Amino acid sequence: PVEITVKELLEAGVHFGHERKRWNPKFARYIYAERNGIHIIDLQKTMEELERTFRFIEDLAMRGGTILFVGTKKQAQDIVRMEAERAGMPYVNQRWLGGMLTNFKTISQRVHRLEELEALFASPEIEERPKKEQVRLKHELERLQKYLSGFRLLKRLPDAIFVVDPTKEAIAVREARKLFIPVIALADTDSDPDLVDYIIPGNDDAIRSIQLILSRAVDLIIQARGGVVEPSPSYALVQEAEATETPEG
RNA sequence: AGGGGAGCCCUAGCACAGGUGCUGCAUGGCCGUCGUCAGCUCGUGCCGUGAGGUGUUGGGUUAAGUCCCGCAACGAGCGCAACC
Numbered sequence: 325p326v327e328i329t330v331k332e333l334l335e336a337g338v339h340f341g342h343e344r345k346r347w348n349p350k351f352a353r354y355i356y357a358e359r360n361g362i363h364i365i366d367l368q369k370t371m372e373e374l375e376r377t378f379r380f381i382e383d384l385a386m387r388g389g390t391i392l393f394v395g396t397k398k399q400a401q402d403i404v405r406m407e408a409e410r411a412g413m414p415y416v417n418q419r420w421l422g423g424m425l426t427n428f429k430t431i432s433q434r435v436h437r438l439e440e441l442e443a444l445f446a447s448p449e450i451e452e453r454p455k456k457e458q459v460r461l462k463h464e465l466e467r468l469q470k471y472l473s474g475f476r477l478l479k480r481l482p483d484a485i486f487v488v489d490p491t492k493e494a495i496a497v498r499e500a501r502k503l504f505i506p507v508i509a510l511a512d513t514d515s516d517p518d519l520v521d522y523i524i525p526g527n528d529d530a531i532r533s534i535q536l537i538l539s540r541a542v543d544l545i546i547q548a549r550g551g552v553v554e555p556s557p558s559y560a561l562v563q564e565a566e567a568t569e570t571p572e573g
Numbered sequence: 574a575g576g577g578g579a580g581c582c583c584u585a586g587c588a589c590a591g592g593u594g595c596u597g598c599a600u601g602g603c604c605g606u607c608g609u610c611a612g613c614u615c616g617u618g619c620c621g622u623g624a625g626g627u628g629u630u631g632g633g634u635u636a637a638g639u640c641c642c643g644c645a646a647c648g649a650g651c652g653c654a655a656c657c
């Protein structure tokens with residue numbers, strides 16, 4: 325049953341039958357206290373820390389600060405970009421690079437090739453040598469973009485970090501704290517609530533939680549201070565958040 | 574008449590020429606050779622008390638450290654290639 329949330333998209337489900345001899349284990353469902361992914365233990369402990377954290381995201385915001393989020397799991401990545409562009413800041417989906425922060429003065433160079441290439445495919449210099457290098461410059465521009473598509477907003481090392489799972493993207497969190505950078509992350513029982521600077525004890529995994537915690541973390545920024553504007557947002561045309569703007573091919 | 578004097582010839586004395594006369598285990602120079610083999614390194618960062626390691630390992634591909642993907646590394650140089 326899809327409570328107006330599922331939407332009938334002619335989803336067959338012919339190959340989706342439970343004929344997968346799934347009728348094999350009785351204890352198949354070892355079930356615990358994790359049936360939908362919404363845990364809040366001790367409350368007087370977590371809610372205390374939340375206010376804490378979210379009070380800073382607000383501060384770093386107003387102080388003009390910057391917050392690059394760090395995403396690495398498939399269980400996020402894209403969920404990192406939406407909350408990325410919606411909130412004008414740098415993000416890292418694909419993969420971290422040793423030094424992303426403890427080497428700026430060098431990884432930032434890559435960012436430069438990137439921009440450099442991005443210039444050339446805009447001037448008449450297009451096509452002046454063998455297709456080979458033409459592609460030699462396309463591979464790069466392409467790759468570079470794959471791994472640097474979000475680091476282009478880091479003219480200088482950031483005031484904070486928002487890594488999802490400070491245990492899977494630990495290098496990130498190492499590099500960070502080695503440079504006195506408050507590290508903000510999700511974290512759970514299977515994490516280092518000692519390393520995480522400003523914790524938000526959500527579910528490390530679980531798409532939903534992510535989008536839930538990461539969004540307000542994005543909205544809180546945006547709503548930093550305020551203003552009038554009371555005609556509210558429109559529904560169906562929420563494309564500026566990114567969605568799937570203009571395709572190529 | 575003749576005398577002085579410059580380039581030069583000759584005897585004599587001298588500084589010295591000359592020497593394929595030793596030493597290439599004193600050397601430059603140039604060459605051979607492993608090897609036309611695919612390799613040898615550097616910057617920055619990270620690991621390590623340290624010598625150092627990481628990158629240059631791994632899967633795949635290549636005539637090739639050639640290229641791909643991975644990865645605490647990101648690059649760059651000499652070489653490979655291309656230029657002839």
Ligand SMILES: [Mg+2]
Nearest residue numbers: 634635636639
């Ligand atoms: Mg070939």
Ligand SMILES: [Mg+2]
Nearest residue numbers: 609636637653
């Ligand atoms: Mg060869």
